[PDB]
Amino acid sequence: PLGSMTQTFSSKTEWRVRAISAANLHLRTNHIYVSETGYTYILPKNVLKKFICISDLRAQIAGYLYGVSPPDNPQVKEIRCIVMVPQWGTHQTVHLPGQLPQHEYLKEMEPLGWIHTQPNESPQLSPQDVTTHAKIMADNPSWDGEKTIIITCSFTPGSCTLTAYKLTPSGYEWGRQNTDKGNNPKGYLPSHYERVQMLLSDRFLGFFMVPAQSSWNYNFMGVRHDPNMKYELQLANPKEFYHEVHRPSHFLNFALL
Amino acid sequence: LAPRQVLDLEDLVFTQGSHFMANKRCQLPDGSFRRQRKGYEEVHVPALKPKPFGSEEQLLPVEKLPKYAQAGFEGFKTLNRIQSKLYRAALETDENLLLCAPTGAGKTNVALMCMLREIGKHINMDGTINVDDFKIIYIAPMRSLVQEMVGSFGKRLATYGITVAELTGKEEISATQIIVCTPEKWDIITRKGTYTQLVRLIILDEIHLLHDDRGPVLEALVARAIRNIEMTQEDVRLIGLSATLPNYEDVATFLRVDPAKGLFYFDNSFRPVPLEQTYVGITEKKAIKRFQIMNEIVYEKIMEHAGKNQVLVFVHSRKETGKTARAIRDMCLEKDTLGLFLREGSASTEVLRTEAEQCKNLELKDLLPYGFAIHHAGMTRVDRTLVEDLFADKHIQVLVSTATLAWGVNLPAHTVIIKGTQVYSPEKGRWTELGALDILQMLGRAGRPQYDTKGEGILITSHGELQYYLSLLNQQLPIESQMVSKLPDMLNAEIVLGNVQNAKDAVNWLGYAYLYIRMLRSPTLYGISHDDLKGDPLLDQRRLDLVHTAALMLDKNNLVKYDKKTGNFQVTELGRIASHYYITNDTVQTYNQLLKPTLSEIELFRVFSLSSEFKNITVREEEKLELQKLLERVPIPVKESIEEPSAKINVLLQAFISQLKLEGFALMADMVYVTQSAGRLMRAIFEIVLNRGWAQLTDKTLNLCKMIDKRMWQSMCPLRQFRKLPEEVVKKIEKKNFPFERLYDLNHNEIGELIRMPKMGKTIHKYVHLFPKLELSVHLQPITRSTLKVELTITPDFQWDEKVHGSSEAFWILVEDVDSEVILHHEYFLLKAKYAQDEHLITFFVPVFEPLPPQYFIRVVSDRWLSCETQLPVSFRHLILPEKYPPPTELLDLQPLPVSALRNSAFESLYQDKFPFFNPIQTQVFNTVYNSDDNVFVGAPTGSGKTICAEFAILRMLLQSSEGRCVYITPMEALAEQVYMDWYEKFQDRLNKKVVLLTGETSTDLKLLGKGNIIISTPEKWDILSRRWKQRKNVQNINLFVVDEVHLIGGENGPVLEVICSRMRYISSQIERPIRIVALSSSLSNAKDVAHWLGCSATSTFNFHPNVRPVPLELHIQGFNISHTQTRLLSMAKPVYHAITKHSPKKPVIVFVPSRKQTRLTAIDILTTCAADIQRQRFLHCTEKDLIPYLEKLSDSTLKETLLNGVGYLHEGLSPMERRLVEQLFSSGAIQVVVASRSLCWGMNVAAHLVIIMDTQYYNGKIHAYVDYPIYDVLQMVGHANRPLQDDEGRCVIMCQGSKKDFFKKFLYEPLPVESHLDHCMHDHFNAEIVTKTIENKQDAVDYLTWTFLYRRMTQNPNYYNLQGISHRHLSDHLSELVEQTLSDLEQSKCISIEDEMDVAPLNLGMIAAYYYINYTTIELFSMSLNAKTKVRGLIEIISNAAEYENIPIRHHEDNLLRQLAQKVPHKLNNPKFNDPHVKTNLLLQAHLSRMQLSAELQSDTEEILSKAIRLIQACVDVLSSNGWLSPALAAMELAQMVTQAMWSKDSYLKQLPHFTSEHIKRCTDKGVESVFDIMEMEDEERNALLQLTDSQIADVARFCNRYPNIELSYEVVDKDSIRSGGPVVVLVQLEREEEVTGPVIAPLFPQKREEGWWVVIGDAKSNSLISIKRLTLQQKAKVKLDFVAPATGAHNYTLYFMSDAYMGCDQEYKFSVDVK
Ligand SMILES: Nc1ncnc2c1ncn2[C@@H]1O[C@H](COP(=O)(O)OP(=O)(O)O)[C@@H](O)[C@H]1O
Ligand SMILES: Nc1ncnc2c1ncn2[C@@H]1O[C@H](COP(=O)(O)OP(=O)(O)O)[C@@H](O)[C@H]1O
Ligand SMILES: [Mg+2]
Ligand SMILES: [Mg+2]
């Protein structure tokens, strides 16, 4: 039997194509774009380009926003720091620990929300981000509903488009209760959010904060990632998505033939 | 000249390499026959008979050799035939030799005989060898042969005390005298360009490698050295050893060998063992049946010698050894023919069985009992030695091995079989024939020189290759040139070295290669017509076409910038890296194309896989299955498909890091070649991306370099790098998901519950702290709001184990920006083992902007250890930037002030003939300096005429007080000598005043300021006299105090300048009559600080900026990308000439070069470019014939030739007279260009129109590193581009490194900020102020600091001095801490006494150090080393260990000089370590007392040492006498006169008088003269005969007699009767000279003049007790009064000593008794 004619299967793991595509992410940093409320948020370009180059085109990654207002002028929020915490995500959402960033450097700043990539550009804010942003507000009173925002960095073809949303009161009480993770949850309305004004600037620079002993990418070590995990922070810049120390299994499974 | 044709180099390449057969036929010796058989054909060549001893050549016994060369031949009784024919040319001549003889004739001993001659050239009086005098290079083809020759040459020459070593992959090269290397190794070394100048002999063993593909390496080595001989005239001897091949006469011409002297050819008949040849050429072309035909022939040949002779079989792979050995044996017992090899009952059989048990090897275990064995590099070291031992003992019968055994071991065999001649070439990606060198070496082992009367060599190959190997082994394979293939790479290597700067240099250089000789003798073989050969008889056009073709290929690949018409070559950083890292030019082109800072690790591996070194690698169809298995699982993804060879190279590299063994035989050989080349390839990519500042890619490539060397990725546990570990635990530690950082702060046994092995407990804790780890701390020092000076502190936090860390550990200090994207600064850090526990300080500058970035990053990454890094974030959140500097003093549009405005006829006579009116800057400050007494500050650029500004204040002082006294301070001694010459004519020759210059010798320095009206001095020179201001009136009576160049306060010797000016202010506050202070400075950013510190009113503060210079300054700053200093200096050579022809084609030019050697090299380079321009003698504006009156006064021959073409040079090694001749010819306009060294920038009395600063770095021989120019030196150099009454402008071009360009723009276009560093050297000044009672408590010390500049700057820039606030409590604590720390160290060294932690008081030690101006550390080491039993030998030792002698340079080209000087020096020292400046100082001291003439630098080094010896000698005198020690004090007192007159205590006193020769004093030591007074009392016509001197030498002898001390001593004990114990005993001593003195001490061998000092010592001789001592200076009459207390009751006898400090033989002794009731 067997067949007149048969072949042998060759493994083609999907992360290899994404890793090759992740190498060209710097080209998108040459074409980033932006899409009222009361608060104006200013994002420095140096940390945003770095946030793009360390991301994945399908697996979403997220970072926490921190900053202050200009000296004698409180109607504007200047984003000053992006914090990378142990995380793993999919094409629709990301999974952060329950603990918020804690460090002396950030005690002189206020939390301004979070920023995350996403594959496809959508005209409306995700139902998962409404659930995530509201559940963070329920567990952390330091996240004001009129101050914290959600910045979406959607991978448009050969470019990057930025959109910033805040949460309405109507959307907060629904995101905290929601347990449906689908795309059309029960009680999801466009009145749950409004768009905040966002401006990129080159006149000042931000900085990054990464875990002390760990790294941030757990998309290849999801077993070690737990929502109750703890972490400290250091003043350093994050590594790329497919850096060597983010996927040890790939290097040693090749060592043991 | 220019008839170029672009050639096709690849079509000129002999593709077969060493297998190329130039001879079309091959004649066989008589008796050779052939036999046709099945499937193959055999060719036999009979053994040649030796040539009967031709003429008078007898075998020379070893005892008939020269006496010194017989130790290298102990163990030999008589030289063989070729050695006895060569020993005379080898040992008795320096002629270049070429020896051609068959393999085994004994060519090595001939090369040894020439090595012995070179070593004999450095015989020592001691009897040893001056090893730092020469160097020998032995070039050997194979690495295995190199290692064995290191041991052989090491043993044969061990009795000579000589180091022979092989170079590691660099203190060893200096330690070795005979370097043994491969041609490629020595090529890489000399490509960089060190210690290659000491090479006197080069031996090119197996020089017939020229025919091989590696041949061009030998051509490059020879052409480089021979051409270097012409431009250096330091001859090098060339010794070539060759086999018997044609064209040996062409090789002789190539080595510059005289055929009638150095050529020696011995045919194959001189083989010591006759050789019967057998060549088996197989006709079967089918691989399978040809394989069995091969195995059938070896069996038939083995059986012919089975039981009769040993057989050595050579295969071409480590795996074939076991296969061939088994395949042979397996067929033997298949035919039952095993009993022939072993007697089955004799001693040979058993010992083959007992060692087969203990052999350990598995493959050899199955073959050793039967008489078989294998040998290859893959086996152990003791197994191979056992195989060699068992075979040498005739136990093994059949040995199958590879070529490594033939090269590395001298293991001959009766019969040798070469099974096949096919080798797999990974470089060529195909199977090729074996190399010619391997064939000759393998068959050379046929026949043992003792047992075998003949050897039997058998070579099996394909039938088509019979003619080749017949030619190779029968003197008929010509040696050709494979040089056209590697020609572009070799031309680039000579361009990077600077040896070839244009095409004509390359055409000349090409004429030294073996290709050129072969092109002349056989042009048809090298694609040249025999008629084109003499349409160009010297092949000028042909070489020029070859150079043109190679230059174009280098230009296209961006290694060289080639000017096609002029022919000039331009080096590039890319072209240098290809040369220094041995990379082909096509590869670095691909690197230049694809390398980008955004590169991923995926593309990085692909970039490596495309290197041209792998251009022949292909993907075989039998490899795709195994390759695809790995491709679908590689950790680094591969974009290319399997069909592409770059994917195969990519996978093979990743498989090598993971340590995976594949099965394909070609894949394994391909993987080795790819990864063997990966080392230098990836290291080249690292240096490219590092110097470009690409932070992310640098980290990627540096890791890949270590992952290739360590063979592990980053994901693994870093403990794998410890090879000494039972591995299966670190793989479990990797399984344990926890970071390696958590193991440091952890128990020695909490490790065991974590990894499951308390079993292997503290074993892990050992290697955790053996892993290198460094801790970093930073102190930010802001210079401006644009620049920050970072002081990085590196503290090691691991432990050194030489078995793990070796002798040093290398690290990379990296300073990255905010985004980890740009490397703002980087440098190389080497942690030596001797400093493995001490902190390290690193200082560098970084730029900053004013939306101050969040933070920078400092990364210290190890160079070889994987995952070995410490990153320190540098936050700027609390960084306090200094305030912006105020706007400058605007230059007023005032009318130019005439010279008549002084309103003084005598004063106007000083400037009337020089210029008509003062410059605008002198115009502004005129009213405040000439018509005012306020303190004035003048800050203007260098060259603004500030010297005249100070002369205004001097001329004003002379009007008020006609005999007033001014003190002028300038920071540099060269500036003081220049100011003294100008102000001597102005104020003394014209105004008839007194102008003096302080000498530094205090013995005649207090005598000038009391004599002169204008005192010119340096800071330290004034500091010693400034300290005693409260008792010496000549310091506080000063009317005017002028300090010049005060901006040097921030320099290395700044604090001394701060102390005196702060002291003059404090003196002026407690002096009733204030002292006027005038400060001159370069343009200062914080000039208001200097004004407020010196009490200058704001209206009298003139702070001008560089834009207001009288002569406008046109500044150009060129950046140069090359990071290699010597290569960067080359890239600036022709730009120096091009800047001259652009900015000053006819006006004078000054060129500043870093070192003394560069002065001559640049002056020749400028003239060579002027020569190629046909502009020769364009810089010569004086007629040639009108210069020889000045020209033939010089000693340097090179200086004469370049001066003949209008180009001079100045350096510290020239004569003091030669410099004045070149300086006068330059200012005269005779010569247009002069090239001055960097160290002469402060004492240059010439100006020019254009100044070119060639580089801003200099090498320091103390720290062994390049040091940047001080910004103060650069400002001084630019100041020379200023001629007020000659040019309308001044121009200066600064050629710097690219990274330093931003620094100069910020600190040259703008005023210079200056800080203070007095807080880093407070001890010596605090001790001085306590001795003179200015500081009596700790509050006084704080009050004392409020008068300084350090102090005021603490509020303007607090972070620079480690302050976090300017609050008046912040600095109050900061001063108190500095006060507490400084006073605690002074009390520790027993110089001050602290009472109740408040009051301080000076001790005897502190009063000595402050008086004689000596460091407090020196006075402490002095106090703990002297006894009552200290003699002259120890006094020289203790003063040599002074801190003032720590910075005496150590030039290690003087090691044997000081080693031999130690033997010539009278006093011998214990523990001779010549790495210490204090030991060298002690040797230079005894060399001066011995009057030993030394080097020009050693004599100069001694001069600077003696300038401090007197004060150190006087210090011990005060220390020894204060402890009642009589004999050492008097000995130290006569050591002072010994140093003065350069004599010893036992030497003759007549050695002081001038012109008294070395021996004609002994002419009269036999008579009755032995004093100077004896010569004084001898009559003319009686005494002018014995002296043997002339009408002028008599007078020098005379004038010493008049000034020689002749004092009449008188002493008196007051009340010689009314004395008893406890009663005062006083003794009056009266001294009076005969006549008197006109002049100081006559001591020509002492640098500084001195005055006659004297001691009066009272002591008890028998008890070594010193009772009373008093210093004094005598002027005609003097009266001294010595007092002490009487001891017990009795009749004690004392002694009165009257000793000088500058003359020997004037001492007086008077014993006297004192009756004490
Ligand atoms: N003068 C000599 N007297 C006795 N034996 C010698 C003498 N010279 C060499 N032998 C031996 O002859 C052999 C030839 O070695 P080698 O010098 O390497 O020859 P070559 O370099 O020409 O191939 C050496 O083992 C050497 O020990
Ligand atoms: N008023 C002046 N008019 C014309 N030429 C001058 C004048 N002053 C100086 N020169 C010359 O310019 C040069 C400047 O030298 P210097 O006085 O040392 O300036 P600085 O000390 O500021 O560097 C001197 O050679 C000096 O002779
Ligand atoms: Mg040899
Ligand atoms: Mg000056």
Side-chain angles (χ1 to χ4, degrees), chain B residues 1660-1673:
Chain B
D1660 199 313
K1662 59 144 293 184
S1663 147
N1664 198 36
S1665 165
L1666 201 150
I1667 322 286
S1668 324
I1669 176 184
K1670 280 206 205 341
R1671 300 139 206 79
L1672 71 141
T1673 59

Side-chain angles (χ1 to χ4, degrees), chain A residues 10-12 15-16 19-20 23 26 46-47 50 104-105 108 203 205-207 212-213 224 235-237 240 243-245 247-248 250-252 254-255 257, chain B residues 598 600-602 630 632-637 639 654-655 658 660 696 700 707 713-715 734 737 739 741 818-820 849 851 854-855 857 871 873 877:
Chain A
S10 298
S11 150
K12 280 107 180 61
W15 67 262
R16 298 175 187 277
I20 294 166
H26 61 281
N46 69 309
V47 298
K50 176 78 71 179
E104 166 224 356
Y105 290 148
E108 305 176 353
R203 73 186 188 273
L205 294 182
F207 61 97
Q213 283 72 51
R224 314 175 207 193
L235 179 50
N237 288 316
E240 318 89 88
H243 190 273
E244 192 150 320
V245 304
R247 43 186 196 96
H250 295 165
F251 294 84
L252 293 66
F254 194 62
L257 309 92
Chain B
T598 51
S600 51
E601 206 164 43
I602 292 179
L630 307 157
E632 55 197 26
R633 281 215 191 149
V634 279
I636 299 299
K639 300 167 297 179
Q654 304 188 44
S658 321
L660 316 168
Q696 286 310 309
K700 286 183 175 59
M707 292 193 296
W713 307 89
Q714 307 178 231
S715 324
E734 285 164 11
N737 303 327
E741 302 165 319
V818 202
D819 297 307
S820 268
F849 39 93
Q855 73 283 313
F857 297 110
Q871 179 183 258
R877 194 166 68 80

Side-chain angles (χ1 to χ4, degrees), chain B residues 1297-1308:
Chain B
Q1297 200 177 355
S1299 59
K1300 276 80 162 61
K1301 182 182 179 184
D1302 181 57
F1303 179 86
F1304 287 119
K1305 286 185 61 178
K1306 282 187 294 184
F1307 290 105
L1308 290 174

Side-chain angles (χ1 to χ4, degrees), chain B residues 1282-1437:
Chain B
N1282 158 74
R1283 303 203 301 174
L1285 300 168
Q1286 283 144 296
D1287 322 313
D1288 296 333
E1289 74 281 298
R1291 283 160 183 159
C1292 171
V1293 170
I1294 295 185
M1295 307 171 181
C1296 61
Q1297 200 177 355
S1299 59
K1300 276 80 162 61
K1301 182 182 179 184
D1302 181 57
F1303 179 86
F1304 287 119
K1305 286 185 61 178
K1306 282 187 294 184
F1307 290 105
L1308 290 174
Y1309 294 136
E1310 276 314 282
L1312 184 72
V1314 288
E1315 304 288 342
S1316 149
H1317 307 92
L1318 182 62
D1319 45 332
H1320 293 118
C1321 49
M1322 197 69 65
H1323 304 74
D1324 286 330
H1325 301 289
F1326 260 25
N1327 178 81
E1329 304 297 335
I1330 296 172
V1331 171
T1332 190
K1333 289 179 150 51
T1334 306
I1335 298 179
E1336 324 197 52
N1337 50 70
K1338 288 180 172 178
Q1339 180 64 44
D1340 287 333
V1342 177
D1343 293 7
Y1344 168 75
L1345 288 177
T1346 68
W1347 291 81
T1348 63
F1349 187 73
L1350 178 273
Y1351 180 100
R1352 282 219 54 261
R1353 293 295 307 174
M1354 283 172 48
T1355 62
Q1356 308 287 334
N1357 190 10
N1359 277 172
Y1360 186 89
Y1361 310 102
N1362 218 30
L1363 281 87
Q1364 292 180 3
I1366 69 170
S1367 98
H1368 284 174
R1369 175 193 64 259
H1370 267 79
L1371 63 141
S1372 165
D1373 297 354
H1374 194 271
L1375 299 165
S1376 278
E1377 290 210 328
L1378 174 69
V1379 160
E1380 290 271 33
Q1381 193 70 28
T1382 309
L1383 294 175
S1384 186
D1385 299 325
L1386 293 179
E1387 189 228 357
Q1388 173 95 294
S1389 288
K1390 307 165 302 302
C1391 300
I1392 69 165
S1393 70
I1394 304 176
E1395 302 300 323
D1396 285 313
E1397 271 226 330
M1398 182 49 60
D1399 305 307
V1400 295
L1403 296 191
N1404 186 71
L1405 283 187
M1407 297 184 306
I1408 290 172
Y1411 186 78
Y1412 295 114
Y1413 206 79
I1414 307 180
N1415 199 342
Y1416 84 108
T1417 60
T1418 295
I1419 220 69
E1420 182 185 16
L1421 182 53
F1422 276 17
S1423 180
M1424 282 174 328
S1425 318
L1426 302 137
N1427 331 290
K1429 325 173 201 183
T1430 304
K1431 287 133 188 58
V1432 180
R1433 40 97 190 92
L1435 291 155
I1436 308 169
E1437 210 37 53

Side-chain angles (χ1 to χ4, degrees), chain B residues 1613-1621 1623-1625 1627 1684 1686-1694 1712-1717:
Chain B
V1613 188
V1614 178
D1615 289 75
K1616 66 179 103 151
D1617 308 332
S1618 324
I1619 329 183
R1620 216 190 52 230
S1621 294
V1625 191
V1627 172
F1684 61 90
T1689 306
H1692 314 273
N1693 308 263
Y1694 304 107
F1712 65 101
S1713 179
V1714 199
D1715 186 71
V1716 48
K1717 292 303 165 177

Side-chain angles (χ1 to χ4, degrees), chain B residues 876-887:
Chain B
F876 300 141
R877 194 166 68 80
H878 294 154
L879 182 64
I880 302 176
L881 283 191
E883 62 175 30
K884 212 273 180 178
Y885 52 92

Side-chain angles (χ1 to χ4, degrees), chain B residues 76 78-80 82-83 101-109 205-206 410:
Chain B
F76 287 88
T78 309
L79 312 178
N80 57 36
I82 67 162
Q83 287 152 7
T103 296
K107 298 191 282 293
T108 302
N109 277 335
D205 194 1
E206 314 281 62
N410 186 12

